[PDB]
């Protein structure tokens, strides 16, 4: 009973100087393989982030393997949320506030593929 989900309903908030992305999981199960897909046209100023026990660093376009997600027992409506700051987690200047509008208004979107066990 393997079900693959591609989630692209990432909503964005902020806490202080840092961006907070969030996507909802519509079915429970045990993740066997997860990967985040970053699509963008503008530089992300070496923004580091955390998602699903995984450290990545989005500079431009990239598809990161969410390594630490293998085995996460998710539930219905469990919100996967992570934090992201530019300059290797230093949040220097209004960069992250710019990178925010690159997420809310398109030009930078996330794509969450999950290989679960339902």
């Amino acid at each position: 009973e393997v079900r693959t989900y591609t989630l692209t309903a990432f909503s964005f908030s902020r806490s202080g100087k840092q961006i907070v992305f969030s996507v909802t999981v519509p079915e429970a199960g045990t993740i066997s393989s997860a990967s985040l897909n970053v699509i963008t046209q503008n530089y992300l100023w070496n923004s580091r982030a955390g998602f699903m026990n995984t450290i990545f660093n989005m500079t431009w376009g990239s598809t990161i393997t969410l390594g630490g997600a293998t085995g996460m027992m998710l539930s219905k409506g469990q919100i996967l949320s992570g934090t992201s700051c530019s300059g290797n987690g230093s949040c220097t200047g209004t960069l992250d506030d710019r990178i925010f509008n690159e997420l809310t208004s398109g030009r930078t979107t996330f794509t969450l593929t999950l290989v679960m066990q339902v």
Partner: nanobody
Amino acid sequence: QLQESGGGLVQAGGSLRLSCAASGTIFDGVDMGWYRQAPGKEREFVAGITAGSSTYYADSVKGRFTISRDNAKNTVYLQMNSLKPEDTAVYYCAAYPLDEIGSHDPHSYWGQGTQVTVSS
């Protein structure tokens, strides 16, 4: 002061070699990328290289183009092969200061933009 060199109208299947002129040491170990922009189209990504000499290409230019940089020359190259008529656009070169002991918000400085055209 950023600036581009190379480019100009070439026929389909031709090749061009753009070079980016980074004026000063402010650009050493700095992430720099290439962008194109046609009339009626917004600025689209093309190719980029990080300080660690990585490679970040677009999809419409994957495998056809090739980016690189000579870290000592302060020059980023974009080798364009198998050129198609959609590649006709002003090719701008952008660099991004990654906390080079700056003061204000590390802005995004660009070049002026060399012209590239592909005829049938």
